[PDB]
Amino acid sequence: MIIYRDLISHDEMFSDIYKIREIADGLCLEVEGKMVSRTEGESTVITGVDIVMNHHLQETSFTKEAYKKYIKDYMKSIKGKLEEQRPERVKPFMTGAAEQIKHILANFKNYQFFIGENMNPDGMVALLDYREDGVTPYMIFFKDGLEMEKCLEHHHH
Amino acid sequence: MIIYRDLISHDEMFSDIYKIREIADGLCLEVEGKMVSNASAEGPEGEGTESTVITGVDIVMNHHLQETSFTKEAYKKYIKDYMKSIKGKLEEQRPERVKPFMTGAAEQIKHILANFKNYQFFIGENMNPDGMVALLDYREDGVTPYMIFFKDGLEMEKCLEHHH
Numbered sequence A: 001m002i003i004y005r006d007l008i009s010h011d012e013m014f015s016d017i018y019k020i021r022e023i024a025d026g027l028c029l030e031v032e033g034k035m036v037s038r039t040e041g042e043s044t045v046i047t048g049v050d051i052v053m054n055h056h057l058q059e060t061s062f063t064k065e066a067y068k069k070y071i072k073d074y075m076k077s078i079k080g081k082l083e084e085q086r087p088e089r090v091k092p093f094m095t096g097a098a099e100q101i102k103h104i105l106a107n108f109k110n111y112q113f114f115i116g117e118n119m120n121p122d123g124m125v126a127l128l129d130y131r132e133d134g135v136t137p138y139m140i141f142f143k144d145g146l147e148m149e150k151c152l153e154h155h156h157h
Numbered sequence B: 001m002i003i004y005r006d007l008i009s010h011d012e013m014f015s016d017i018y019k020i021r022e023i024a025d026g027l028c029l030e031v032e033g034k035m036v037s038n039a040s041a042e043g044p045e046g047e048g049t050e051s052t053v054i055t056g057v058d059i060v061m062n063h064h065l066q067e068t069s070f071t072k073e074a075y076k077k078y079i080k081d082y083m084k085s086i087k088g089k090l091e092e093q094r095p096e097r098v099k100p101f102m103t104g105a106a107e108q109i110k111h112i113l114a115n116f117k118n119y120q121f122f123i124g125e126n127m128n129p130d131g132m133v134a135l136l137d138y139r140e141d142g143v144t145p146y147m148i149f150f151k152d153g154l155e156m157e158k159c160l161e162h163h164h
Helices: A050-054 A064-085 A089-104 B058-063 B072-093 B095-114
Strands: A002-006 A012-015 A021-024 A026-032 A035-040 A044-049 A056-059 A112-115 A123-129 A137-142 A146-150 B002-005 B012-017 B021-022 B028-032 B067-069 B121-125 B132-137 B145-148 B154-158
Touching: A002 A021, A012 A050, A050 A137, A064 A089, A112 B145, B012 B145, B058 B121, B072 B095, B072 B121
Parallel strands: none
Antiparallel strands: A002 A012, A002 A146, A021 A026, A026 A137, A035 A044, A056 A112, A112 A123, A123 A137, B002 B012, B002 B154, B021 B028, B028 B145, B067 B121, B121 B132, B132 B145
16 A cells, blocks of 8 residues: 655545656646545435545635636745755756646636635645546646555564 | 554555544444445436446545455354454454453344344455454445444554654
8 A cells, every 4th residue: 555645735645546747848746536435324325426426635726816816826835845855856846837837827617625624725726527428526636746656565573 | 534444454445534433332343434436318218327326435445445245144154253252352362342342243243133234344455354343334325334343353553654
């Protein structure tokens, strides 16, 4: 098991129980979800994306203007982290993110927006969209905004 | 995140992303799962519509649990040996638990056998014949899946969060 945590907010975002692939020349991780149904007490049936339910992701929303403002600031926060920790990623992050912002805005209506449980305005905003079948959910995260935590092997002395 | 692992086989069985409760005086854990699954219709002239039952359970898919099956005779033999293996581990590691484990498991075995046809049977990814067999059943609502594990047959392992 590997946990993927938001570098800024420290929220758990997802784990490797889902299919994960790199897209956008290594800038983003695309995490394929499943639609699932849980029940709450007579029972009520509640359907949604597994990734969102399992990791307590919170739906949020934005105007385009507010998203443009937010995403510019988010890039600057990640640039600063990369400068300290991984200076080799700075250039591909900044050019890659510049390209992606234009495309996210061009397709703004197609997305739903999710943040970590803490709902930190500085944290990552994951994007939810659906495959060509219109039914299989997938979520997009910025790889440079995530920290990987392996669940380590545990032994007795 | 906390991982629950089979004490014998070392397989990951589940994690604390599910609703979990203890039952039978702390002998077992019940882990609640989630169901995983053109408007044309033929009407009376055709056949009835297909069943809407949802047969998928997320716990199984997420932790690579493997369905297995048993005759009632083979399950009796297996579960008796499984208790002996657990008693052993408790003797080595938690001697206090032996007595309530053996009475509690004796009761549980009779309950399971009485309700044998109600279960599906799942083991960890390694498919070790000495490992735990988790039992899948459905709540009284008819539709919510849950899985039963022997708590004494599990090890809890935290995924330790990093210092940031």
